[PDB]
Design an enzyme around this catalytic site. Structure first.
Site, short mmCIF file in Angstrom:
data_model
loop_
_atom_site.label_atom_id
_atom_site.label_comp_id
_atom_site.label_asym_id
_atom_site.label_seq_id
_atom_site.Cartn_x
_atom_site.Cartn_y
_atom_site.Cartn_z
N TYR A 1 0.81 -1.20 0.00
CA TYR A 1 0.00 0.00 0.00
C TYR A 1 0.85 1.27 0.00
O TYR A 1 1.89 1.35 0.67
CB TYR A 1 -0.90 0.05 1.24
N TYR B 1 -1.38 -9.71 0.87
CA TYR B 1 -0.29 -9.21 1.68
C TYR B 1 -0.51 -9.58 3.09
O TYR B 1 -1.63 -9.62 3.60
CB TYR B 1 -0.13 -7.70 1.57
N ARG C 1 -3.94 -11.46 3.73
CA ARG C 1 -5.18 -11.06 3.09
C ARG C 1 -5.20 -11.62 1.66
O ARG C 1 -4.17 -11.53 0.96
CB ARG C 1 -5.32 -9.53 2.98
N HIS D 1 -7.40 -8.06 -2.79
CA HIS D 1 -8.71 -7.39 -2.58
C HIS D 1 -8.66 -5.92 -2.92
O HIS D 1 -7.61 -5.30 -2.82
CB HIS D 1 -9.18 -7.55 -1.13
N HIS E 1 -10.74 -2.44 -1.71
CA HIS E 1 -11.71 -1.77 -0.82
C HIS E 1 -12.67 -0.91 -1.64
O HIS E 1 -12.25 -0.21 -2.55
CB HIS E 1 -10.97 -0.92 0.20
FE LIG Z 1 -6.51 -3.97 2.55
#
Ligand SMILES: [Fe+3]
Ligand SMILES: Oc1ccc(F)cc1O
Ligand SMILES: Oc1ccc(F)cc1O
Ligand SMILES: Oc1ccc(F)cc1O
Ligand SMILES: Oc1ccc(F)cc1O
Ligand SMILES: Oc1ccc(F)cc1O
Ligand SMILES: Oc1ccc(F)cc1O
Ligand SMILES: Oc1ccc(F)cc1O
Ligand SMILES: Oc1ccc(F)cc1O
Ligand SMILES: Oc1ccc(F)cc1O
Ligand SMILES: Oc1ccc(F)cc1O
Ligand SMILES: Oc1ccc(F)cc1O
Ligand SMILES: Oc1ccc(F)cc1O
Ligand SMILES: Oc1ccc(F)cc1O
Ligand SMILES: Oc1ccc(F)cc1O
Ligand SMILES: Oc1ccc(F)cc1O
Ligand SMILES: Oc1ccc(F)cc1O
Ligand SMILES: Oc1ccc(F)cc1O
Ligand SMILES: Oc1ccc(F)cc1O
Ligand SMILES: [Cl-]
Ligand SMILES: [Cl-]
Ligand SMILES: [Fe+3]
Ligand SMILES: [Fe+3]
Ligand SMILES: [Fe+3]
Ligand code: NA
Ligand code: NA
EC number: 1.13.11.3
Lengths: 200, 238, 238, 200, 236, 200, 200
Positions: free
Chosen positions: C108, C147, C157, C160, C162
């Site tokens: 991220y 990640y 996770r 995905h 959001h």
């Molecule tokens: Fe996330």
């Protein structure tokens, strides 16, 4: 019946096979040690020869992305399996067709005679495996030599090919490349003059 | 030098893809039309190169570090590992395993790849290693992206890694492709579907292997490879 | 100004994740212990912002171009598209859809992300758009990588994206997460499994959509979103 | 019974919610137009106020990654739904807690009174939705004002909270921030002084 | 000079019993309410005691002779044997296995046991041994009786033997309980049912093993134990 | 995905755990060799210390039937795995709380510094596993020392605990017991001051 | 994945296709208005041309029951979709091979240049769909012109054909028929000189 574990199934080597197995040809940097197309150091025993060929599809067009693996006895008829770039001779090598001319080359020595499992001498030969985009499982063939006619006529492997005309597809043509002894071995995957491919 | 001391179980060529699989368009003109000629195994077929003495670079098996131009490749960090056995279940030790793949966006580092997706300056896409004394291999890499190709008008390869495995002889040598568990592109691919038996395709699908992951670092996938069964000769010539 | 002219079907809070889902460790201390207090709908709850007049940049919906620092992001190029409808099946037009995600390696672009995987200098990871007059939205992006995170000692996770969707009122506003068809990490994730009903989880899984792909360019995934049903008031006050 | 399509289920906004909805706070560049925490241009009608608060977990620790959405009537008791950065007043805004102090701020006007569906006046209030890492579905609450005690005592929504002590959790405390009128509204997700959360 | 040279597969804490299992009443006040904090493995976690040179007595593994006060214990003579392996199927040789149990009537030789059933003067209830070089252990004992206990108003433990296994590191150390094939008390027990997954409970049920019995002497039960998978580090 | 053999699931050690693992505390005769609470004979190198503590349940009451296993480096920061009652030092021991007072004791040396897997020094610590009636799977924690503040501040394990206030729960308090250096380490299983427990 | 409604599958037009789509060739009366082989009235702008061709099967024999549909830009490179027998030019027409000679004819104008979707000019072309008995789904091809060599060399559609030799199959041959400019475009469905067919 008894069923073993199934073999992992083959898939095509694909157009970008060179990335993994022919790094220079991909256009990429090479590693310190590569498995390639010079089987014989200049002072290796035997008669030093160049092999070259082109590969044709069923439409008569060059297969410019083919990759070949070769396995042959040394001049004394011995298979040298301990692969090493410092060996005078490796029985194993790899080559690939150039994209422009579609031509592969190999630098080696003429192999000596080896016997089959029943003790019968086979004519001098190079075992070839052909890989390429569009080839789902590699094709096995043998390269024999047109100046070994007596040996070829008695080869117990050539003699398993029912039609004499098809035997001719496995015989490389002696020639000269830059003045040096060479043999040309073109492969026709399909159609007129189709090269014999083996299963074993 | 090499000796003829073994035989290799005959291949099932209805388990392997056949040569002519016309949905894979390039196979139409690159498949033989004559039958293969069967021959008995001789020393020429039952021997092959051993690569124990090939000089491997320190990072040859690590695609995260073996094309280092200033940083790490961008992509899903993964270990790809497994075991090479023969059809009798016997490990195949000290055997050469080679692999090649596209980057995270499905771009190959190859002059002939016309796909628009960018190269990754820190990813080359080739690896090699030797199985250990118990038949296990492992690589570290990034998960390749799918990528579009000129077969049908909207065909996409599933994410895949090309594998070559030498094994004990030229009879055992195999090139194949690893795919990834759950990828919805797999059943749509004409190259996958060159294999007629879906159970055979299952053998090419690597499974997510959480037990082998490095936490906070990389996931892992398991891909085991089965080469032709090797047995001693028996009752020959006599 | 806004008027109270509709009612919204009551939420099923056993279909949604409950607040206390202890396998997702952070939920333990961030979940209420008292019951929610139910209240009737008033104009305060049945109205909300409409974003028709928000100024959108040309590339706000295109994550391939909206963080352009000299090149294209590395990763699997994809369209993510779908329709926003309510529970009666009615399209929800001119509604704000926002999304945010990691890059192809699961990194991220956020100061608090401690994951080692590199940033992509050409990927930011945010998009927004308004559904069209028929309820459809679309984004172009790269597929995010999984990640690793500090929940259990080896938790990851699934890939995905959001999503936030405004809808017609503050009663309809939803934040959720899109997952990808066939991802083997989905059934292992404690955040996914905050949702008790696996049929509800199915609603968060985007399907591969080959019909919407651009050949030789990008794949596509379809993700439809259902907001609370809106109906007129009837027999009230009288 | 009649079953409609199921609503898409909620999931946590997660720790990196700011990437999508609070770009500056993520540490990132912002776009030309952002939805944020200034509801009122300086010349908007009504009494200009600052709102601020902190958010606490069940252990009494600050929730430093929370994200809040607010919806309120303007000073004349009207909901302004046509969101526009050029409006004198937006009924909608967003704010987030700073990571250092865990404090959010909002610049707005005190809302006017609006009636419930039965025509009964509600006390002045701000509708709040709270999102964060660890919050699987957002929490709804209302911020009312401690200098509206008469109105609060008759609010038909506050009156649905059975216990008077819990009503107190929704009443923001008038104070001064840099000399300006402000109201502090702390949220306690869990435990002692737990804030009332609504379902509707 | 213990060394960090391996990693252990992460535990599945939905396979194991959770901490808070309220039908097992004492777990309510003895379970944490904060989440466990995950940490990476270090030499502190990946090493542990090797008990190869702990001095075992002749009868340490034989509860029929290790509390001899002039006779044999009363009860069903049994061998309890099995293999300790890790999750990869690797044997766990030379590891410490300890066991404790009540006597034939469900009476424990412990000052805190208030059950009315009598002690057996020739039964103590403890054993220990090391697995051999192929991972196998064996004890000889009497089958313990079920036990009433103050949980619900008519709760009874199934017949059980407590087990402790050290394994290669503190990360692998495990305490568990063995139960006996077919015991109708097993699905009624709130301690058994602290394990949410009935397939996990199956792993605690020892099977009658007629092949390992001594005819005219003692029966036998088989109880195999699986400790966390151990693997080498890679790409660290 | 790949699924291995399942681990044998844990069960409570139960109230009579002492029969098996703490023979004297059960009221029973002991065997020739027992594993118990004296990790260091008087002549072992390092600072000799007494450790003691009590264990509290969620209602603040003593857990009188606790059983603790400990694992620590010697004074030079080396783990000694070859367990032998002849050794001057063993890295492993066992203790239990007395049934009347609820107190456990250990006799050991202060452990030296050991690095984590990334090469970063951890503060001096003793690894503890806690077992008891009502504990379904044992609880892992660490005992650190209040006279190692600088090292504790930089410990990469302690720094994985998000809240500083929770780190304090793992710091044992230096004192003197009969003129000798001691540290008290109380464990609170549940509630206020709840001790940090680890998964690894 | 997402699956739409399946397309209605194709079937052969069959030997009596002329009943429906080529009434005169069936031996039948025609209706007032028919869609046929004259795309340009004599007064339409552009170079007026006759097109003719024969269709061969895999054994080199004429396909006498072929039905062709054509689609082309007008002389200014614009497709005219509003079909009307009053128009001086229509972009669409139909033809069929005669049963004795096997020859089809078209009367049209040479189409102007049109860009592909990326903005790259395509060489002048007529789009052809071929239907017949024994053809299960119609075959798509393009007719280009041998007097547009420079444009053909740069056509981004022609350049998708991997082999140059196959590109030649789509180039019609300029000639004269009764003093008028004509082009012959033969189609070989199968075998030597097999015409390139497209999927799109
Ligand atoms: Fe996330
Ligand atoms: O027996 C033969 C061997 C090689 C060849 F070219 C032809 C033959 O008939
Ligand atoms: O070898 C062949 C295989 C399949 C086929 F249809 C024709 C062949 O000549
Ligand atoms: O064993 C054999 C296998 C194939 C063949 F053609 C001949 C043989 O003698
Ligand atoms: O020389 C190379 C080394 C590593 C790699 F991934 C690609 C290369 O071309
Ligand atoms: O041959 C096949 C293999 C895999 C599959 F999913 C479908 C096929 O038709
Ligand atoms: O090297 C080998 C030789 C014979 C055999 F059966 C198996 C082998 O691995
Ligand atoms: O509100 C609650 C929800 C679940 C629970 F276990 C306890 C609560 O107080
Ligand atoms: O309609 C209602 C719904 C919830 C509530 F608490 C009161 C109401 O009048
Ligand atoms: O300002 C931004 C724009 C696009 C994006 F993906 C991220 C940003 O922070
Ligand atoms: O709640 C769940 C949701 C999805 C799933 F695969 C498993 C679950 O337990
Ligand atoms: O705007 C609306 C108002 C009432 C209703 F039922 C549906 C709507 O979409
Ligand atoms: O009715 C009430 C309203 C607000 C408050 F703080 C307390 C109350 O009892
Ligand atoms: O605090 C908690 C509450 C309920 C639960 F299941 C686990 C917890 O750790
Ligand atoms: O770096 C880490 C932090 C916490 C954890 F559980 C595992 C890790 O690898
Ligand atoms: O010292 C003991 C020896 C054996 C036994 F079963 C119990 C004991 O307390
Ligand atoms: O959790 C359980 C375990 C075993 C069983 F028989 C029932 C259960 O509910
Ligand atoms: O970092 C810390 C370590 C130990 C402690 F007690 C408090 C801290 O903040
Ligand atoms: O590019 C070409 C175009 C038309 C043709 F006939 C041959 C070509 O090589
Ligand atoms: Cl060369
Ligand atoms: Cl501000
Ligand atoms: Fe590929
Ligand atoms: Fe017991
Ligand atoms: Fe018909
Ligand atoms: Na096919
Ligand atoms: Na949970």
């Amino acid at each position: 019946p008894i069923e073993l574990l199934p073999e992992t199934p083959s898939q095509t080597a694909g157009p970008y096979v060179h990335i993994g197995l022919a790094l220079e040809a991909a256009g990429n940097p090479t590693r310190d040690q590569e498995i390639w197309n010079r089987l014989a150091k200049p002072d290796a025993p035997g008669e030093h020869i160049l092999l070259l060929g082109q590969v044709y599809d069923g439409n008569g067009h060059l297969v410019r992305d083919s990759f070949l693996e070769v396995w042959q006895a040394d001049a004394n008829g011995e298979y040298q399996d301990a692969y090493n770039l410092e060996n005078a001779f490796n029985s194993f090598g790899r080559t690939a067709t150039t994209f422009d001319a579609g031509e592969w080359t190999l630098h080696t020595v003429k192999p000596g005679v080896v016997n089959n499992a029943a003790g019968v001498p086979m004519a001098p030969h190079i075992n070839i495996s052909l890989f390429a985009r569009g080839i789902n499982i590699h094709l096995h063939t043998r390269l024999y030599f047109d100046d070994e006619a007596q040996a070829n006529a008695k080869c117990p492997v050539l003699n398993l090919i029912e039609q004499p005309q098809r035997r001719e597809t496995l015989i490389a043509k002696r020639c000269e490349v830059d003045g040096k002894t060479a043999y040309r071995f073109d492969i026709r995957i399909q159609g007129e003059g189709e090269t014999v491919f083996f299963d074993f | 030098p090499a000796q003829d001391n073994s035989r290799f179980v005959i291949r099932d060529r209805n388990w392997h893809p056949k040569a002519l699989t016309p949905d894979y368009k390039t196979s139409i003109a690159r498949s033989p039309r004559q039958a293969l000629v069967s021959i008995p195994q001789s020393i020429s077929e039952t021997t092959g190169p051993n690569f124990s003495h090939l000089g491997f670079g320190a990072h040859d098996h690590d695609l995260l570090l073996n094309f280092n131009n200033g940083g790490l490749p961008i992509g899903e960090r993964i270990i790809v590992a497994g075991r090479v056995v023969d059809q009798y279940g016997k490990p195949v030790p000290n055997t050469l395993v080679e692999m090649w793949q596209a980057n995270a966006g499905g771009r190959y580092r190859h002059k002939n790849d016309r796909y628009l997706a960018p190269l990754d300056p820190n990813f080359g896409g080739v690896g090699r290693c030797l199985t250990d004394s118990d038949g296990y291999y492992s690589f570290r890499t990034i998960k390749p992206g799918p990528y579009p190709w000129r077969n049908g008008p909207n065909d996409w390869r599933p994410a895949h890694i090309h594998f070559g495995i030498s094994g004990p002889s030229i009879a055992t040598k195999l090139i194949t492709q690893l795919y990834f568990e759950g990828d919805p592109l797999i059943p749509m691919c004409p190259i996958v579907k060159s294999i007629a038996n879906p159970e055979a395709v299952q053998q090419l699908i690597a499974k997510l292997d959480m037990n082998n992951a490095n936490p906070m670092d990389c996931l892992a996938y398991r891909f085991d490879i089965v080469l032709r069964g090797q047995r001693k000769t028996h009752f020959e010539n006599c």
